[PDB]
Amino acid sequence: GSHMRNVAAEQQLRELESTFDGRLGFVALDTATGARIAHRADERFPFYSTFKTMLSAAVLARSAGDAALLQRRIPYAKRDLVRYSPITEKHVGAGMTVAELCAATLQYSDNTAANLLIALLGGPQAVTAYARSIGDATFRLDRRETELNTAIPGDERDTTTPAAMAASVRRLLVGDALGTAQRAQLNAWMLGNKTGDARIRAGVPAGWRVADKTGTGDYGTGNDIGVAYPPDRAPIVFVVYTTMRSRNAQARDDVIASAARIAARAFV
Asked: Can you tell me whether residue 201 is helix, strand or coil?
């Protein structure tokens, strides 16, 4: 890569942002060099379900000191279910194990699973505290699902910046934030995500493996974060936040995929 190619990529991101009503917040980091491609990197965006990566990391960190935590079963009832709970709705009554809840919240974006894990940790502020412990001074989790999706202009609740989330994703999936085994489990869960096939994954070359977590608020909104593992080069961190409200899902997904494609072009 080169600085000149990264500058061209940033111009291409400004051009991409001009094709929709709204803002694009983008960081890609080439871990081979630390080179960064950035656009609105220090502006806050609603994170939506992308916080579930930080939540699951906090659970995994606790599990390193409690060998049974991931196998603990959490009961819950129909009245606990919030909207968008495709896995937890199947197991009302005796409930699911902590590991199963992490897998469901990461791979299917299950909202009740996230709420149960937030409660396990002691409330949303425990996720913020975990973010601080890994060096993220920006992330803040203030509410539960689904109230954290309100995305009110100027409201900093339940937001982060592209730069802070990219740094945290790097530390969690590629770096030293977690212990070996927990870093690996977080990668394994996010590699198996089922909700992101049209987002970052759609913008990277065939043969790259992607560990991602999507976020979607109201209809037509969304984002995606993760790490791509090229087959023979170093991992690349991708963070794509937006404030768009698109006409349909594919229009929004095309923007996210295009943003990833711009950075992949610069780093190959």
From this structure: helix
Any residues with CB less than 8 A from the CB of 260 and at least 6 apart, and which?
A: 28, 199, 200, 202, 203, 204, 224, 228, 238, 240
Q: Do residues 81 and 89 touch, judged by C-beta distance below 8 A?
A: yes
49 catalytic per annotation: yes
Q: Domain containing 80 — which CATH number?
A: 3.40.710.10
Q: Which residue has the tokens 């502006």?
A: 43
Q: Which of these is catalytic: 49, 56, 109, 258?
A: 49
For this entry, resolution in Å reads 1.3
Task: Write the CB contacts of 81 (distance below 8 Å, at least 6 apart in sequence).
Answer: 88, 89, 92, 112
Peptide bond into 146 cis (omega under 30): yes
Experimentally determined by: X-ray
Q: Which residue range forms the structural domain that includes residue 145? A: 1-268
User: Which has the closest alpha carbon to 43: 29, 22, 58?
Assistant: 22
3-state SS assignment for residue 180 = helix
Q: Enter the tokens of residue 242.
A: 């937006």
Count of domains for the chain = 1
